[PDB]
Amino acid sequence: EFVPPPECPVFEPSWEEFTDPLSFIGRIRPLAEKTGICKIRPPKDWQPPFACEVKSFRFTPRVQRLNELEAMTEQAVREYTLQSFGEMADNFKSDYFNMPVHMVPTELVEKEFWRLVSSIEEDVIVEYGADISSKDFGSGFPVKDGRRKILPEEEEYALSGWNLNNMPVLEKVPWLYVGMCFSSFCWHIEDHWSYSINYLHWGEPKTWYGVPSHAAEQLEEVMRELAPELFESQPDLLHQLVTIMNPNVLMEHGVPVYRTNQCAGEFVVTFPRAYHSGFNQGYNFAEAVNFCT
């Protein structure tokens, strides 16, 4: 079965350290750049409200066939609200595992996910509300946009440097991700080798795998050896749309891989040229942006 990679670093900054994100990320860099990804838990009382326009949030998620690459050698189109997507997502997971959604071990979803990706016997199909522009229905963080009411208790979050809308981006706006069990993202790095930062507003965890930048060429070499040859000649920007690869394959080839379960209220930071991939444990809502130092 699947062997979980070692855990990436988790930081629990004090209020003093939590004052400036770029200063904190610079200070953790000597460790975090050696693991590619890291997780940051804000202080316990740092709880931003969810600020998307929930009544009008409507989207058509993309369909994901888990074993599509293995099948190299149909489904109807569905529009959802946030509520109706969650009902679908929870019903899917509880039916699949025959138990309540929060009782399914994170290790079991992870093991099953990687089995299904390589299985030709069972064709599991899921849906992912990925790459939703925060311009559509607003960011999940409060913003001094004047469009949505900012309560006094929320102004500190509108002004916080950990609000993804306030990260420096000039060498763009955050994107939103509505997940369900087994929805996923394949191995990639950011445009211009940028950092990325991801906040899980609510829901079940997002499971990540990361590779430090010093091993980027090692990963690309394993891809060269083992990814489907039909896509081998493709430029990286296109290959990255279908670069699905079990972390144990990279590990067997000597590529360092680290993992984490990002829970609600936690940030993940990916360092420049740190390959990463992952999948969602269940119904959740994330926001991410590329930033520059």
Ligand SMILES: O=C(O)CCC(=O)C(=O)O
């Ligand atoms: O959560 C996802 O689907 C993608 C996240 C990602 O690639 C990022 O935050 O850099």
Ligand SMILES: [Mn+2]
């Ligand atoms: Mn990314």
